[PDB]
Amino acid sequence: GSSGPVPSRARVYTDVNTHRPSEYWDYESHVVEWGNQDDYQLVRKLGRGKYSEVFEAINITNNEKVVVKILKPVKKKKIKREIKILENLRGGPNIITLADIVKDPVSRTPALVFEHVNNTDFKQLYQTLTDYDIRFYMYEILKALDYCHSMGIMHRDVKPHNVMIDHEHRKLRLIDWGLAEFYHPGQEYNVRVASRYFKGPELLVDYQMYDYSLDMWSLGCMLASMIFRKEPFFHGHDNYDQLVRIAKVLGTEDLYDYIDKYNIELDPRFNDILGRHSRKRWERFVHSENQHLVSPEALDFLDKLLRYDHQSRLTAREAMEHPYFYTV
Numbered sequence: 001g002s003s004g005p006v007p008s009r010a011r012v013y014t015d016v017n018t019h020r021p022s023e024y025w026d027y028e029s030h031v032v033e034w035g036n037q038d039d040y041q042l043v044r045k046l047g048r049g050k051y052s053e054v055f056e057a058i059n060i061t062n063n064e065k066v067v068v069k070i071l072k073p074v075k076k077k078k079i080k081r082e083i084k085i086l087e088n089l090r091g092g093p094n095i096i097t098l099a100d101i102v103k104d105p106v107s108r109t110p111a112l113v114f115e116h117v118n119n120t121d122f123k124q125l126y127q128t129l130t131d132y133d134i135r136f137y138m139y140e141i142l143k144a145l146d147y148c149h150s151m152g153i154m155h156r157d158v159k160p161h162n163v164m165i166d167h168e169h170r171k172l173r174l175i176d177w178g179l180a181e182f183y184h185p186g187q188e189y190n191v192r193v194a195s196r197y198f199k200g201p202e203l204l205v206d207y208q209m210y211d212y213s214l215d216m217w218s219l220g221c222m223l224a225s226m227i228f229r230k231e232p233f234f235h236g237h238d239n240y241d242q243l244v245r246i247a248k249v250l251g252t253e254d255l256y257d258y259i260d261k262y263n264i265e266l267d268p269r270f271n272d273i274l275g276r277h278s279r280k281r282w283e284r285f286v287h288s289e290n291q292h293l294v295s296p297e298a299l300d301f302l303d304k305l306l307r308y309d310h311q312s313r314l315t316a317r318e319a320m321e322h323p324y325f326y327t328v
């Protein structure tokens, strides 16, 4: 056996970028126009990322609250990609609105201006959600994902911190498109994306020909953590250990079937840590503290998202048609 990995392509929206003019997806050729940041007054720091600083601000022209993301310009091509994707998706359902692109006159630092969302941190909100609330918000994220997938884009960083929820107004926004990328059938992508707990098995086994289905694995991780009140659901201490946490639930038999279907070469680092694990029933995770959030429908939907085989997972459109969402 010396044939290399078996190629794969998305089951939906496969050729959406192929049939569009290069302007749409060639972000390296996109010309960015930077406005004057003097129209925005910074109020408070909301967070600090690896390559950004996020601030709550006021637009002085209309006295409205906005969010200003000041980017550390470490990679210009990466800045061009995020802007192009945000402009392509601008106005889509539950997608954060890019309101402006500006630079401070003195620093010349690239900054993105977004609509403000009055978010409740997940570490305080998720404990208060009812069975209905989880169904409702999951449907809202699905509307965002089916939209961006239809637009030939994969988010590649779906996690609670990238889902802003204004619970009082039942408004949800999918944010931080900095890791997002255009889907091109047959393209080999960098596997060093998403946050450890939400990384799909495809990333962990170094299978580069992934697609939109990566976002469906991440969504499943969020769902499992919400219905079982276990944060994170798969608690790896590193990227290799992350796959072992997954294998302790999904079992090692189905993992070997996955890597055999795509002729994947498993890294030798997995040899002494993987072990042998039985497939666990989803009902094993039900306890007194979470049983009011779990149902046969919830478990059937979860089982259809958390599969090693990226091709076998529900697409966002199939997911929207699941019985779990008949009440929304």
Ligand SMILES: Nc1cc(Br)cnc1N
Binding pocket: 046, 054, 067, 096, 114, 115, 116, 117, 118, 119, 164, 175, 176
């Ligand atoms: N933290 C935050 C980011 C964005 Br973008 C919009 N609203 C927020 N609350």
